[PDB]
Design a protein around this ligand. Sequence first.
Ligand SMILES: *[C@@H]1O[C@H](CO)[C@@H](O[C@@H]2O[C@H](CO)[C@@H](O)[C@H](O)[C@H]2NC(C)=O)[C@H](O)[C@H]1NC(C)=O
Ligand SMILES: *[C@@H]1O[C@H](CO)[C@@H](O[C@@H]2O[C@H](CO)[C@@H](O)[C@H](O)[C@H]2NC(C)=O)[C@H](O)[C@H]1NC(C)=O
Ligand SMILES: *[C@@H]1O[C@H](CO)[C@@H](O)[C@H](O)[C@H]1NC(C)=O
Ligand SMILES: *[C@@H]1O[C@H](CO)[C@@H](O)[C@H](O)[C@H]1NC(C)=O
Ligand SMILES: *[C@@H]1O[C@H](CO)[C@@H](O)[C@H](O)[C@H]1NC(C)=O
Lengths: 148, 50, 50, 50, 49, 99
Amino acid sequence: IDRLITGRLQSLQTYVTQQLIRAAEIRASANLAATKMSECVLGQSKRVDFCGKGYHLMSFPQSAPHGVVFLHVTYVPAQEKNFTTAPAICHDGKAHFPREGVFVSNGTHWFVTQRNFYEPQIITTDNTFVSGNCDVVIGIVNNTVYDP
Amino acid sequence: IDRLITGRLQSLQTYVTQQLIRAAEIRASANLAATKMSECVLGQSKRVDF
Amino acid sequence: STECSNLLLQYGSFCTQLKRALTGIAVEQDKNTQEVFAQVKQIYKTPPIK
Amino acid sequence: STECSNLLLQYGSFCTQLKRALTGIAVEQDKNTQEVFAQVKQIYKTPPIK
Amino acid sequence: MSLGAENSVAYSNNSIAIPTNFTISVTTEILPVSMTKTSVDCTMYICGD
Amino acid sequence: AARDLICAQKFNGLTVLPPLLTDEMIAQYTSALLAGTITSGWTFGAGAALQIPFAMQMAYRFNGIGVTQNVLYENQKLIANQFNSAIGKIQDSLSSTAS
Ligand SMILES: *[C@@H]1O[C@H](CO)[C@@H](O[C@@H]2O[C@H](CO)[C@@H](O)[C@H](O)[C@H]2NC(C)=O)[C@H](O)[C@H]1NC(C)=O
Ligand SMILES: *[C@@H]1O[C@H](CO)[C@@H](O[C@@H]2O[C@H](CO)[C@@H](O)[C@H](O)[C@H]2NC(C)=O)[C@H](O)[C@H]1NC(C)=O
Ligand SMILES: *[C@@H]1O[C@H](CO)[C@@H](O)[C@H](O)[C@H]1NC(C)=O
Ligand SMILES: *[C@@H]1O[C@H](CO)[C@@H](O)[C@H](O)[C@H]1NC(C)=O
Ligand SMILES: *[C@@H]1O[C@H](CO)[C@@H](O)[C@H](O)[C@H]1NC(C)=O
């Protein structure tokens, strides 16, 4: 009986130790799931590759046996085109930098457009600001800037 | 032989339990490194001291 | 030794669960390395101009 | 007890690995407190105006 | 084993590429939360009345 | 005559399995990540890789941290020299100190 008691006690202690380690792993995954519920679903996340692959827009929770399932809605750019760019535009001895965007060119004319989508616009003084002269910035180009 | 078997079984069980705990610690460090590769290298992070 | 194996067979399935734990650790290490380093879908390269 | 020490010496190196584990935990606690609280490099103090 | 398809981006010091369209993609992520709760009686398991 | 520790470890029934990914494949993955980061910015982590000049990528990073991009475009050589000196310093600190 003492032999059997020692063997069954060892078996039960092994089971309890394995259950404790698996419970620690499950608690780590549950903490990650709670963080994902707080940040993906209840808001919008700027963290890269958190809340899915791409630029995160929305997330939805779904129930599951012994877990949770997230449906991450993301924004993926699709069709790109080659363009010629420049860091600044030299106009009347002044360096013009874009406010929020990027200078592009279709070969002949220069446009300023946003970075994640191709929506070209005429370079005016409303979307560009002035800082310095044209002999400091490397790669500056000559163009006119429309004044409304 | 039974005494030697019990001693070596206890030694092997202790080694396996220690390796399991070390594996949990290494997996936590690997998850942190994967998050750092996802956020630092693949983008720009606004989190302070990350 | 055959007699030691015949006496060790009386102790049940401790060897099988030790082998299962070590196999789980060994698979988990490759999973850690794969989830840290294999984050890019294509193998990019630098142009020869530097 | 000398007889118990002589009989305990036959069991190998359980005592050393248990002492190593407890020493690792003891160092880890001080590392935890240092990495939580000691995030600042200089001891700033409040001006006398409040 | 093969790590992936070989790619070589056309880097230049006056060339940029800007997307003109997009896709809306929905992905799925599964995370365990809890496991099955257990309770063991010693006297019934080891001895059995 | 000088028996190794690894020989006794192997002979007593303990076997060390090789990793699935060799160090050459790890270096290839790291090289791909570096080439994507250098030549495409953050665009290779959200879809297809989009080329951009590195100075304009650095101006995007400075606009990210809250500094106007004319600070980069008028101080580009100083920032490049500071980065090259920092990489030289981290090489020296890695070669000298062994801890
Ligand atoms: C770049 O875009 C501009 C503006 O869209 C183009 O200029 C116009 O092109 C049309 C097409 O012949 C003409 O009818 C307009 O008179 C042009 N506008 C001006 C102000 O000249 C330009 O052709 C485009 N360049 C290329 C190479 O496609
Ligand atoms: C942007 O992409 C969408 C698809 O994601 C394009 O929409 C498709 O256009 C083709 C061409 O006319 C149609 O045959 C499909 O039925 C459209 N799919 C839809 C409406 O779901 C869209 O044309 C693209 N925009 C461009 C190229 O400017
Ligand atoms: C842009 O130019 C490169 C090299 O000139 C070419 O390989 C590529 O197909 C072009 N188009 C796009 C959309 O990248
Ligand atoms: C831009 O105009 C100025 C003055 O008109 C001239 O000195 C400069 O060479 C021009 N830039 C280029 C690239 O020709
Ligand atoms: C820009 O690139 C071209 C071709 O790669 C090269 O000839 C030129 O020297 C580069 N510009 C500078 C300032 O090095």
